[PDB]
Design a protein around this ligand. Structure first.
Ligand SMILES: NS(=O)(=O)c1c(F)c(F)c2c(c1F)N(Cc1ccccc1)CCS2(=O)=O
Ligand SMILES: NS(=O)(=O)c1c(F)c(F)c2c(c1F)N(Cc1ccccc1)CCS2(=O)=O
Ligand SMILES: [Zn+2]
Ligand SMILES: [Zn+2]
Lengths: 259, 260
Protein backbone atom coordinates (compact mmCIF):
# COMPACT_ATOMS: atom_id res chain seq x y z
CA UNK A 1 0.00 0.00 0.00
CA UNK A 2 1.10 3.58 -0.67
CA UNK A 3 -0.22 7.16 -0.62
CA UNK A 4 -0.27 7.55 -4.45
CA UNK A 5 -0.87 5.78 -7.78
CA UNK A 6 -2.92 2.61 -8.01
CA UNK A 7 -2.10 1.32 -4.50
CA UNK A 8 -3.10 4.63 -2.82
CA UNK A 9 -5.76 5.26 -0.25
CA UNK A 10 -8.86 4.64 -2.40
CA UNK A 11 -7.64 1.08 -2.97
CA UNK A 12 -6.62 0.22 0.65
CA UNK A 13 -10.00 -1.40 1.30
CA UNK A 14 -9.23 -4.16 -1.23
CA UNK A 15 -6.64 -5.79 1.00
CA UNK A 16 -7.62 -4.09 4.27
CA UNK A 17 -11.41 -4.20 4.57
CA UNK A 18 -11.57 -2.02 7.65
CA UNK A 19 -10.38 0.91 5.52
CA UNK A 20 -13.85 0.88 3.96
CA UNK A 21 -15.64 0.33 7.28
CA UNK A 22 -16.95 2.48 10.08
CA UNK A 23 -15.28 4.99 12.41
CA UNK A 24 -12.54 5.98 9.95
CA UNK A 25 -9.97 8.68 10.71
CA UNK A 26 -8.79 11.40 10.16
CA UNK A 27 -11.61 13.95 10.23
CA UNK A 28 -12.22 17.66 10.05
CA UNK A 29 -12.59 19.23 13.50
CA UNK A 30 -15.09 22.08 13.12
CA UNK A 31 -17.31 24.08 15.49
CA UNK A 32 -20.72 22.50 14.53
CA UNK A 33 -19.60 19.07 15.74
CA UNK A 34 -17.70 20.02 18.93
CA UNK A 35 -19.22 19.58 22.37
CA UNK A 36 -17.57 20.40 25.70
CA UNK A 37 -17.32 17.39 28.00
CA UNK A 38 -16.32 18.00 31.63
CA UNK A 39 -15.20 14.35 31.96
CA UNK A 40 -12.19 15.14 29.78
CA UNK A 41 -9.62 15.60 32.53
CA UNK A 42 -5.87 16.28 31.84
CA UNK A 43 -3.74 13.36 30.78
CA UNK A 44 -0.50 12.69 32.60
CA UNK A 45 2.53 11.59 30.54
CA UNK A 46 4.56 9.09 32.57
CA UNK A 47 7.92 7.65 31.66
CA UNK A 48 8.21 10.21 28.78
CA UNK A 49 11.56 11.47 30.02
CA UNK A 50 13.58 8.72 28.27
CA UNK A 51 16.92 7.74 29.73
CA UNK A 52 19.66 9.65 27.93
CA UNK A 53 21.75 6.54 28.63
CA UNK A 54 19.48 4.48 26.39
CA UNK A 55 19.10 4.40 22.64
CA UNK A 56 15.81 4.27 20.74
CA UNK A 57 15.51 2.91 17.24
CA UNK A 58 14.46 5.17 14.36
CA UNK A 59 13.28 3.37 11.26
CA UNK A 60 12.15 3.95 7.74
CA UNK A 61 9.66 1.16 6.98
CA UNK A 62 8.83 2.50 3.51
CA UNK A 63 5.47 3.71 4.71
CA UNK A 64 6.73 5.72 7.61
CA UNK A 65 9.70 6.98 9.71
CA UNK A 66 9.00 5.82 13.24
CA UNK A 67 10.78 6.09 16.59
CA UNK A 68 10.33 2.99 18.77
CA UNK A 69 9.32 3.77 22.33
CA UNK A 70 9.58 1.69 25.50
CA UNK A 71 6.55 0.21 27.18
CA UNK A 72 7.38 1.86 30.57
CA UNK A 73 6.24 5.07 28.82
CA UNK A 74 2.49 5.50 29.26
CA UNK A 75 -0.53 7.78 29.51
CA UNK A 76 -2.26 8.00 32.86
CA UNK A 77 -5.79 9.37 33.13
CA UNK A 78 -7.70 7.05 30.78
CA UNK A 79 -9.72 4.11 32.25
CA UNK A 80 -6.84 1.72 31.47
CA UNK A 81 -3.15 2.36 31.21
CA UNK A 82 -2.06 2.89 27.59
CA UNK A 83 1.62 2.17 26.97
CA UNK A 84 3.60 3.75 24.18
CA UNK A 85 4.86 1.79 21.21
CA UNK A 86 6.12 4.31 18.63
CA UNK A 87 5.83 7.83 17.27
CA UNK A 88 5.86 9.05 13.66
CA UNK A 89 4.88 12.04 11.53
CA UNK A 90 2.80 12.96 8.47
CA UNK A 91 3.55 15.82 6.06
CA UNK A 92 2.88 17.28 2.62
CA UNK A 93 5.46 18.48 0.12
CA UNK A 94 7.45 21.69 -0.57
CA UNK A 95 5.00 22.87 -3.22
CA UNK A 96 1.99 22.41 -0.89
CA UNK A 97 3.36 22.24 2.68
CA UNK A 98 0.05 21.32 4.36
CA UNK A 99 0.07 17.67 5.22
CA UNK A 100 -1.55 17.22 8.63
CA UNK A 101 -4.10 14.39 8.80
CA UNK A 102 -6.68 16.09 10.95
CA UNK A 103 -7.94 19.49 9.79
CA UNK A 104 -9.44 22.31 11.90
CA UNK A 105 -12.29 24.29 10.27
CA UNK A 106 -11.28 22.71 6.98
CA UNK A 107 -7.61 23.79 7.22
CA UNK A 108 -4.58 21.58 7.17
CA UNK A 109 -1.60 22.24 9.35
CA UNK A 110 1.90 21.81 7.95
CA UNK A 111 2.40 18.38 9.54
CA UNK A 112 1.19 16.15 12.37
CA UNK A 113 2.94 14.03 15.05
CA UNK A 114 1.33 10.82 16.36
CA UNK A 115 2.37 8.99 19.53
CA UNK A 116 0.81 5.47 19.31
CA UNK A 117 -0.15 3.67 22.54
CA UNK A 118 -1.96 0.42 23.32
CA UNK A 119 -4.05 -0.82 26.25
CA UNK A 120 -1.44 -2.75 28.17
CA UNK A 121 -3.88 -3.50 31.06
CA UNK A 122 -5.98 -5.66 28.70
CA UNK A 123 -3.51 -6.73 25.99
CA UNK A 124 0.12 -7.90 25.68
CA UNK A 125 1.31 -5.75 22.79
CA UNK A 126 0.04 -3.18 20.29
CA UNK A 127 -0.30 -5.73 17.49
CA UNK A 128 -2.61 -7.86 19.58
CA UNK A 129 -4.52 -4.80 20.90
CA UNK A 130 -5.04 -3.28 17.47
CA UNK A 131 -8.13 -5.29 16.47
CA UNK A 132 -9.57 -5.35 19.97
CA UNK A 133 -12.07 -3.38 22.07
CA UNK A 134 -10.48 -0.35 23.74
CA UNK A 135 -7.24 -1.38 22.04
CA UNK A 136 -5.37 1.76 21.00
CA UNK A 137 -4.91 5.43 21.92
CA UNK A 138 -3.07 7.91 19.71
CA UNK A 139 -1.93 11.39 20.72
CA UNK A 140 -1.84 13.91 17.85
CA UNK A 141 0.14 17.14 17.75
CA UNK A 142 -0.58 19.64 14.95
CA UNK A 143 2.58 21.29 13.58
CA UNK A 144 2.86 24.75 11.93
CA UNK A 145 5.87 26.60 10.54
CA UNK A 146 7.38 29.20 12.96
CA UNK A 147 10.42 29.38 15.20
CA UNK A 148 13.07 26.63 15.27
CA UNK A 149 12.19 23.82 17.64
CA UNK A 150 15.25 22.23 19.34
CA UNK A 151 13.18 19.33 20.64
CA UNK A 152 11.86 18.23 17.27
CA UNK A 153 15.45 18.56 16.03
CA UNK A 154 16.35 15.68 18.39
CA UNK A 155 14.48 13.52 15.81
CA UNK A 156 15.04 15.51 12.64
CA UNK A 157 18.89 15.60 13.02
CA UNK A 158 18.86 11.83 12.40
CA UNK A 159 16.70 11.75 9.27
CA UNK A 160 19.61 11.56 6.77
CA UNK A 161 20.59 8.22 8.29
CA UNK A 162 17.12 6.76 7.58
CA UNK A 163 16.62 8.14 4.06
CA UNK A 164 15.78 4.75 2.52
CA UNK A 165 13.35 1.97 3.34
CA UNK A 166 14.97 -0.54 5.72
CA UNK A 167 17.49 1.92 7.18
CA UNK A 168 17.72 2.44 10.95
CA UNK A 169 19.45 4.86 13.31
CA UNK A 170 19.80 5.03 17.07
CA UNK A 171 18.36 8.07 18.90
CA UNK A 172 19.55 8.77 22.50
CA UNK A 173 16.67 9.10 24.93
CA UNK A 174 15.18 12.62 25.42
CA UNK A 175 12.03 14.01 27.07
CA UNK A 176 9.23 13.15 24.61
CA UNK A 177 6.91 15.55 26.48
CA UNK A 178 8.97 18.33 24.84
CA UNK A 179 7.23 17.43 21.57
CA UNK A 180 3.80 18.22 23.02
CA UNK A 181 2.22 21.68 22.73
CA UNK A 182 1.22 24.23 25.29
CA UNK A 183 -1.81 23.54 27.48
CA UNK A 184 -2.10 19.84 26.82
CA UNK A 185 -5.21 19.98 29.05
CA UNK A 186 -6.99 21.43 25.96
CA UNK A 187 -7.78 18.67 23.44
CA UNK A 188 -10.27 17.14 21.07
CA UNK A 189 -11.38 13.54 21.75
CA UNK A 190 -13.21 11.06 19.54
CA UNK A 191 -13.36 7.34 18.70
CA UNK A 192 -11.84 6.57 15.33
CA UNK A 193 -9.36 4.41 13.48
CA UNK A 194 -5.79 3.95 12.41
CA UNK A 195 -5.16 6.29 9.46
CA UNK A 196 -3.14 3.67 7.64
CA UNK A 197 -3.86 0.02 6.83
CA UNK A 198 -5.25 -1.99 8.46
CA UNK A 199 -7.44 1.01 9.45
CA UNK A 200 -8.81 -0.77 12.54
CA UNK A 201 -11.59 1.25 14.21
CA UNK A 202 -10.03 0.77 17.63
CA UNK A 203 -8.35 4.14 18.34
CA UNK A 204 -9.22 6.65 21.01
CA UNK A 205 -7.92 9.89 19.47
CA UNK A 206 -6.66 12.83 21.47
CA UNK A 207 -5.78 15.77 19.23
CA UNK A 208 -4.26 18.63 21.20
CA UNK A 209 -5.92 21.99 20.66
CA UNK A 210 -2.74 24.01 20.26
CA UNK A 211 -0.09 23.41 17.56
CA UNK A 212 3.67 23.40 17.95
CA UNK A 213 6.12 25.23 15.75
CA UNK A 214 9.03 24.13 13.71
CA UNK A 215 11.16 26.29 11.42
CA UNK A 216 10.93 26.71 7.68
CA UNK A 217 14.17 24.72 7.36
CA UNK A 218 13.04 21.92 9.71
CA UNK A 219 9.81 21.48 7.73
CA UNK A 220 11.70 21.39 4.45
CA UNK A 221 14.14 18.79 5.86
CA UNK A 222 11.21 16.61 6.93
CA UNK A 223 9.62 16.93 3.48
CA UNK A 224 12.81 16.25 1.49
CA UNK A 225 14.98 13.91 3.59
CA UNK A 226 13.15 10.59 3.07
CA UNK A 227 12.31 8.18 0.24
CA UNK A 228 9.68 5.47 0.32
CA UNK A 229 11.99 2.98 -1.56
CA UNK A 230 15.08 0.89 -0.81
CA UNK A 231 18.47 2.43 -1.59
CA UNK A 232 18.98 0.12 -4.59
CA UNK A 233 15.54 0.74 -6.14
CA UNK A 234 16.05 1.96 -9.75
CA UNK A 235 12.76 3.92 -9.50
CA UNK A 236 13.01 5.95 -6.26
CA UNK A 237 9.91 7.42 -4.60
CA UNK A 238 10.07 10.52 -2.33
CA UNK A 239 8.27 10.09 1.00
CA UNK A 240 5.85 13.03 0.61
CA UNK A 241 2.13 13.61 1.02
CA UNK A 242 2.01 10.73 3.53
CA UNK A 243 -1.37 11.69 5.01
CA UNK A 244 -4.85 10.24 4.49
CA UNK A 245 -7.67 12.47 3.21
CA UNK A 246 -10.32 13.33 5.79
CA UNK A 247 -13.23 10.95 6.13
CA UNK A 248 -16.97 11.60 6.36
CA UNK A 249 -18.02 11.94 10.00
CA UNK A 250 -21.92 12.16 10.09
CA UNK A 251 -24.24 12.24 13.15
CA UNK A 252 -21.25 12.28 15.50
CA UNK A 253 -19.54 14.65 17.90
CA UNK A 254 -16.02 15.38 18.78
CA UNK A 255 -15.75 16.06 22.44
CA UNK A 256 -13.61 18.91 23.71
CA UNK A 257 -11.95 19.41 27.07
CA UNK A 258 -12.33 23.19 26.57
CA UNK A 259 -15.31 25.43 25.96
CA UNK B 1 -25.09 -1.07 -5.77
CA UNK B 2 -22.42 1.60 -5.00
CA UNK B 3 -23.50 4.16 -2.47
CA UNK B 4 -22.22 7.19 -0.53
CA UNK B 5 -22.51 5.49 2.86
CA UNK B 6 -21.65 2.11 4.37
CA UNK B 7 -19.80 -0.95 2.91
CA UNK B 8 -20.52 0.13 -0.63
CA UNK B 9 -19.43 3.72 -0.01
CA UNK B 10 -16.64 5.69 -1.57
CA UNK B 11 -13.61 3.98 0.04
CA UNK B 12 -14.87 0.72 -1.55
CA UNK B 13 -15.73 1.99 -5.08
CA UNK B 14 -12.32 0.96 -6.40
CA UNK B 15 -13.05 -2.70 -5.58
CA UNK B 16 -15.54 -2.78 -8.49
CA UNK B 17 -14.52 0.33 -10.49
CA UNK B 18 -10.74 0.41 -10.89
CA UNK B 19 -10.56 3.97 -12.17
CA UNK B 20 -11.88 5.18 -8.80
CA UNK B 21 -8.46 4.20 -7.42
CA UNK B 22 -6.54 5.60 -10.39
CA UNK B 23 -5.11 8.97 -11.31
CA UNK B 24 -6.73 12.35 -11.99
CA UNK B 25 -9.64 11.90 -9.59
CA UNK B 26 -12.20 14.55 -8.69
CA UNK B 27 -13.38 16.48 -6.75
CA UNK B 28 -10.56 18.50 -5.20
CA UNK B 29 -9.99 21.33 -2.74
CA UNK B 30 -9.29 24.63 -4.49
CA UNK B 31 -6.57 26.41 -2.49
CA UNK B 32 -3.82 28.90 -3.23
CA UNK B 33 -0.82 26.55 -3.38
CA UNK B 34 -2.18 24.67 -6.36
CA UNK B 35 -3.74 27.59 -8.34
CA UNK B 36 -2.08 29.33 -11.28
CA UNK B 37 -3.41 32.05 -13.49
CA UNK B 38 -3.63 31.17 -17.18
CA UNK B 39 -4.39 34.12 -19.50
CA UNK B 40 -5.35 31.62 -22.27
CA UNK B 41 -8.55 30.71 -20.36
CA UNK B 42 -10.90 32.91 -22.34
CA UNK B 43 -14.67 33.06 -21.77
CA UNK B 44 -16.89 30.14 -22.67
CA UNK B 45 -19.85 30.81 -24.84
CA UNK B 46 -23.17 29.17 -23.83
CA UNK B 47 -25.27 28.35 -26.94
CA UNK B 48 -28.82 27.05 -26.96
CA UNK B 49 -29.10 27.23 -23.16
CA UNK B 50 -32.39 29.15 -23.48
CA UNK B 51 -34.68 26.13 -23.70
CA UNK B 52 -38.21 26.79 -24.94
CA UNK B 53 -40.83 26.99 -22.16
CA UNK B 54 -43.23 25.23 -24.55
CA UNK B 55 -40.94 22.15 -24.70
CA UNK B 56 -40.35 19.73 -21.84
CA UNK B 57 -37.28 17.91 -20.59
CA UNK B 58 -37.14 14.62 -18.71
CA UNK B 59 -36.16 14.59 -15.03
CA UNK B 60 -35.22 11.07 -13.84
CA UNK B 61 -34.24 9.48 -10.52
CA UNK B 62 -31.81 6.66 -11.42
CA UNK B 63 -31.22 5.68 -7.78
CA UNK B 64 -27.84 7.39 -7.59
CA UNK B 65 -28.80 10.84 -8.86
CA UNK B 66 -31.74 12.82 -10.17
CA UNK B 67 -30.76 14.21 -13.56
CA UNK B 68 -32.45 16.58 -15.99
CA UNK B 69 -31.85 15.45 -19.58
CA UNK B 70 -30.69 18.22 -21.88
CA UNK B 71 -30.87 18.53 -25.68
CA UNK B 72 -27.76 18.15 -27.81
CA UNK B 73 -28.43 21.57 -29.46
CA UNK B 74 -27.26 23.06 -26.17
CA UNK B 75 -23.51 23.68 -26.50
CA UNK B 76 -20.44 25.24 -24.95
CA UNK B 77 -18.04 27.03 -27.28
CA UNK B 78 -14.59 28.12 -26.38
CA UNK B 79 -13.19 24.71 -25.76
CA UNK B 80 -11.08 23.41 -28.51
CA UNK B 81 -13.98 21.24 -29.63
CA UNK B 82 -17.65 22.04 -29.28
CA UNK B 83 -19.27 20.19 -26.37
CA UNK B 84 -22.97 19.39 -26.26
CA UNK B 85 -24.97 19.15 -23.06
CA UNK B 86 -26.37 15.80 -21.98
CA UNK B 87 -27.73 16.30 -18.42
CA UNK B 88 -27.48 18.29 -15.24
CA UNK B 89 -27.73 17.15 -11.61
CA UNK B 90 -26.84 18.28 -8.07
CA UNK B 91 -24.96 17.11 -4.98
CA UNK B 92 -26.01 17.99 -1.43
CA UNK B 93 -25.72 17.17 2.27
CA UNK B 94 -28.58 16.52 4.70
CA UNK B 95 -31.08 18.52 6.81
CA UNK B 96 -28.82 18.53 9.86
CA UNK B 97 -25.65 19.29 7.84
CA UNK B 98 -26.38 21.39 4.67
CA UNK B 99 -22.79 21.11 3.42
CA UNK B 100 -22.74 18.84 0.43
CA UNK B 101 -20.70 20.48 -2.33
CA UNK B 102 -18.11 18.22 -3.97
CA UNK B 103 -15.42 20.79 -4.63
CA UNK B 104 -14.27 22.77 -1.63
CA UNK B 105 -12.61 26.20 -1.65
CA UNK B 106 -9.81 26.81 0.85
CA UNK B 107 -11.12 23.75 2.77
CA UNK B 108 -14.77 24.76 3.12
CA UNK B 109 -17.80 23.04 1.70
CA UNK B 110 -20.60 24.91 0.07
CA UNK B 111 -24.21 23.91 0.68
CA UNK B 112 -24.56 22.07 -2.65
CA UNK B 113 -23.18 21.95 -6.17
CA UNK B 114 -24.73 21.86 -9.67
CA UNK B 115 -23.04 19.92 -12.48
CA UNK B 116 -23.88 20.43 -16.17
CA UNK B 117 -22.42 17.46 -18.03
CA UNK B 118 -21.32 17.90 -21.68
CA UNK B 119 -19.62 15.59 -24.14
CA UNK B 120 -17.48 16.24 -27.16
CA UNK B 121 -20.10 16.07 -29.93
CA UNK B 122 -17.53 17.01 -32.61
CA UNK B 123 -15.86 13.63 -31.97
CA UNK B 124 -18.44 11.31 -30.41
CA UNK B 125 -22.11 10.41 -31.01
CA UNK B 126 -23.13 10.30 -27.36
CA UNK B 127 -21.79 10.95 -23.85
CA UNK B 128 -21.39 7.22 -22.99
CA UNK B 129 -18.97 6.79 -25.91
CA UNK B 130 -17.17 10.07 -25.04
CA UNK B 131 -16.76 9.07 -21.39
CA UNK B 132 -13.82 6.72 -21.99
CA UNK B 133 -11.97 9.10 -24.33
CA UNK B 134 -9.38 11.73 -23.41
CA UNK B 135 -11.15 15.07 -22.70
CA UNK B 136 -14.34 13.31 -23.93
CA UNK B 137 -16.39 15.10 -21.24
CA UNK B 138 -16.62 18.68 -19.94
CA UNK B 139 -18.49 19.40 -16.74
CA UNK B 140 -19.47 22.85 -15.55
CA UNK B 141 -19.76 23.19 -11.78
CA UNK B 142 -21.66 25.86 -9.87
CA UNK B 143 -21.08 26.14 -6.13
CA UNK B 144 -24.31 26.77 -4.19
CA UNK B 145 -24.53 28.75 -0.95
CA UNK B 146 -27.44 28.96 1.49
CA UNK B 147 -28.90 32.40 0.83
CA UNK B 148 -31.83 33.93 -1.05
CA UNK B 149 -34.64 31.94 -2.63
CA UNK B 150 -33.70 31.21 -6.24
CA UNK B 151 -36.69 31.08 -8.63
CA UNK B 152 -34.58 29.62 -11.46
CA UNK B 153 -33.37 26.62 -9.43
CA UNK B 154 -36.95 26.22 -8.20
CA UNK B 155 -37.93 25.43 -11.81
CA UNK B 156 -36.13 22.10 -11.12
CA UNK B 157 -36.71 21.73 -7.38
CA UNK B 158 -40.52 22.16 -7.63
CA UNK B 159 -40.65 18.77 -9.47
CA UNK B 160 -38.51 16.71 -7.08
CA UNK B 161 -41.55 15.51 -5.03
CA UNK B 162 -42.56 13.77 -8.29
CA UNK B 163 -39.35 11.78 -8.82
CA UNK B 164 -38.86 10.76 -5.17
CA UNK B 165 -38.04 7.12 -5.97
CA UNK B 166 -35.61 5.26 -8.18
CA UNK B 167 -36.99 4.76 -11.70
CA UNK B 168 -39.46 7.67 -11.56
CA UNK B 169 -39.50 10.30 -14.29
CA UNK B 170 -41.20 13.72 -14.67
CA UNK B 171 -41.22 16.48 -17.28
CA UNK B 172 -39.85 19.94 -16.60
CA UNK B 173 -40.83 22.79 -18.96
CA UNK B 174 -37.86 24.43 -20.66
CA UNK B 175 -36.23 27.46 -19.12
CA UNK B 176 -33.05 29.39 -19.64
CA UNK B 177 -30.34 27.19 -18.13
CA UNK B 178 -27.99 30.18 -18.03
CA UNK B 179 -30.13 31.41 -15.13
CA UNK B 180 -28.51 28.65 -13.05
CA UNK B 181 -25.00 30.10 -13.64
CA UNK B 182 -23.40 32.64 -11.29
CA UNK B 183 -22.15 36.14 -11.91
CA UNK B 184 -19.02 36.68 -13.97
CA UNK B 185 -18.85 33.30 -15.67
CA UNK B 186 -15.63 34.53 -17.31
CA UNK B 187 -14.00 33.81 -13.89
CA UNK B 188 -13.44 30.10 -13.38
CA UNK B 189 -11.13 27.32 -12.26
CA UNK B 190 -10.10 24.75 -14.89
CA UNK B 191 -8.44 21.37 -14.33
CA UNK B 192 -8.23 17.84 -15.68
CA UNK B 193 -10.10 15.32 -13.57
CA UNK B 194 -12.66 12.59 -13.44
CA UNK B 195 -16.26 11.63 -12.95
CA UNK B 196 -17.01 11.96 -9.22
CA UNK B 197 -19.05 8.76 -9.23
CA UNK B 198 -18.28 5.26 -10.52
CA UNK B 199 -16.88 4.48 -12.98
CA UNK B 200 -14.67 7.50 -12.09
CA UNK B 201 -13.23 7.75 -15.61
CA UNK B 202 -10.42 10.36 -15.75
CA UNK B 203 -11.84 11.97 -18.86
CA UNK B 204 -13.40 15.22 -17.61
CA UNK B 205 -12.32 18.77 -18.26
CA UNK B 206 -13.71 20.55 -15.18
CA UNK B 207 -14.75 24.21 -15.11
CA UNK B 208 -15.75 25.36 -11.63
CA UNK B 209 -17.08 28.92 -11.68
CA UNK B 210 -15.42 31.27 -9.21
CA UNK B 211 -18.62 32.77 -7.79
CA UNK B 212 -21.38 30.77 -6.09
CA UNK B 213 -25.12 31.12 -6.50
CA UNK B 214 -27.61 31.15 -3.61
CA UNK B 215 -30.64 28.98 -2.89
CA UNK B 216 -32.71 29.25 0.29
CA UNK B 217 -32.69 27.13 3.44
CA UNK B 218 -36.18 26.00 2.48
CA UNK B 219 -35.02 24.96 -1.00
CA UNK B 220 -32.11 23.06 0.53
CA UNK B 221 -34.39 21.32 3.03
CA UNK B 222 -36.78 20.28 0.23
CA UNK B 223 -33.85 18.97 -1.81
CA UNK B 224 -32.41 17.12 1.20
CA UNK B 225 -35.74 15.47 2.17
CA UNK B 226 -37.53 14.77 -1.14
CA UNK B 227 -35.53 11.98 -2.66
CA UNK B 228 -34.70 8.31 -2.18
CA UNK B 229 -32.08 6.11 -3.78
CA UNK B 230 -34.49 3.14 -3.68
CA UNK B 231 -37.58 2.04 -5.53
CA UNK B 232 -41.06 3.01 -4.30
CA UNK B 233 -41.65 -0.57 -3.07
CA UNK B 234 -38.25 -1.24 -1.51
CA UNK B 235 -38.53 -2.61 2.08
CA UNK B 236 -35.15 -1.07 3.03
CA UNK B 237 -35.50 2.58 1.85
CA UNK B 238 -32.42 4.78 1.63
CA UNK B 239 -32.63 8.58 1.56
CA UNK B 240 -30.71 10.37 -1.20
CA UNK B 241 -28.57 12.53 1.08
CA UNK B 242 -24.86 13.26 1.47
CA UNK B 243 -24.35 12.39 -2.18
CA UNK B 244 -20.91 13.98 -2.55
CA UNK B 245 -17.49 12.37 -2.81
CA UNK B 246 -14.64 13.51 -0.49
CA UNK B 247 -11.91 15.60 -2.11
CA UNK B 248 -9.00 13.71 -3.68
CA UNK B 249 -5.23 14.01 -3.53
CA UNK B 250 -4.00 16.30 -6.18
CA UNK B 251 -1.35 13.87 -7.78
CA UNK B 252 -1.86 18.60 -10.80
CA UNK B 253 -2.35 22.41 -10.86
CA UNK B 254 -5.68 24.12 -11.23
CA UNK B 255 -5.63 26.96 -13.75
CA UNK B 256 -7.59 30.14 -13.13
CA UNK B 257 -9.03 32.60 -15.64
CA UNK B 258 -8.68 35.32 -12.97
CA UNK B 259 -5.41 36.50 -11.52
CA UNK B 260 -6.79 38.05 -8.32
N1 LIG C 1 -1.40 7.34 11.78
S1 LIG C 1 -1.39 5.87 12.58
O1 LIG C 1 -1.01 6.13 13.95
O2 LIG C 1 -2.65 5.20 12.30
C1 LIG C 1 -0.15 4.87 11.81
C2 LIG C 1 0.70 5.27 10.81
F1 LIG C 1 0.68 6.50 10.29
C3 LIG C 1 1.63 4.40 10.25
F2 LIG C 1 2.43 4.83 9.28
C4 LIG C 1 1.73 3.08 10.69
C5 LIG C 1 0.92 2.64 11.72
C6 LIG C 1 -0.02 3.55 12.25
F3 LIG C 1 -0.82 3.13 13.23
N2 LIG C 1 0.98 1.33 12.13
C7 LIG C 1 -0.28 0.58 12.37
C8 LIG C 1 -0.41 -0.17 13.67
C9 LIG C 1 -0.26 0.47 14.91
C10 LIG C 1 -0.40 -0.24 16.10
C11 LIG C 1 -0.70 -1.60 16.05
C12 LIG C 1 -0.87 -2.25 14.83
C13 LIG C 1 -0.73 -1.54 13.64
C14 LIG C 1 2.25 0.63 12.08
C15 LIG C 1 2.58 0.43 10.63
S2 LIG C 1 2.92 2.01 9.92
O3 LIG C 1 2.68 1.99 8.51
O4 LIG C 1 4.23 2.35 10.39
N1 LIG D 1 -20.54 14.38 -10.77
S1 LIG D 1 -20.52 13.61 -12.25
O1 LIG D 1 -20.91 14.57 -13.26
O2 LIG D 1 -19.25 12.92 -12.37
C1 LIG D 1 -21.76 12.32 -12.21
C2 LIG D 1 -22.62 12.05 -11.16
F1 LIG D 1 -22.61 12.74 -10.02
C3 LIG D 1 -23.55 11.01 -11.23
F2 LIG D 1 -24.35 10.79 -10.20
C4 LIG D 1 -23.64 10.21 -12.37
C5 LIG D 1 -22.81 10.46 -13.47
C6 LIG D 1 -21.88 11.52 -13.35
F3 LIG D 1 -21.07 11.80 -14.37
N2 LIG D 1 -22.88 9.64 -14.58
C7 LIG D 1 -21.65 9.22 -15.26
C8 LIG D 1 -21.55 9.37 -16.75
C9 LIG D 1 -21.71 10.62 -17.37
C10 LIG D 1 -21.60 10.76 -18.74
C11 LIG D 1 -21.32 9.64 -19.52
C12 LIG D 1 -21.14 8.40 -18.92
C13 LIG D 1 -21.25 8.25 -17.54
C14 LIG D 1 -24.16 9.03 -14.93
C15 LIG D 1 -24.44 8.00 -13.87
S2 LIG D 1 -24.80 8.86 -12.38
O3 LIG D 1 -24.53 7.99 -11.24
O4 LIG D 1 -26.11 9.42 -12.56
ZN1 LIG E 1 -0.08 8.59 12.11
ZN1 LIG F 1 -21.91 15.56 -10.33
Amino acid sequence: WTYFGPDGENSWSKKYPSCGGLLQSPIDLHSDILQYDASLTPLEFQGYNLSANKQFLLTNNGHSVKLNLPSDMHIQGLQSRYSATQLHLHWGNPNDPHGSEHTVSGQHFAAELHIVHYNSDLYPDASTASNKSEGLAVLAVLIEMGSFNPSYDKIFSHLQHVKYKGQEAFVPGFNIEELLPERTAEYYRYRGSLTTPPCNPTVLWTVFRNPVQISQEQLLALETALYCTHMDDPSPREMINNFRQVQKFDERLVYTSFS
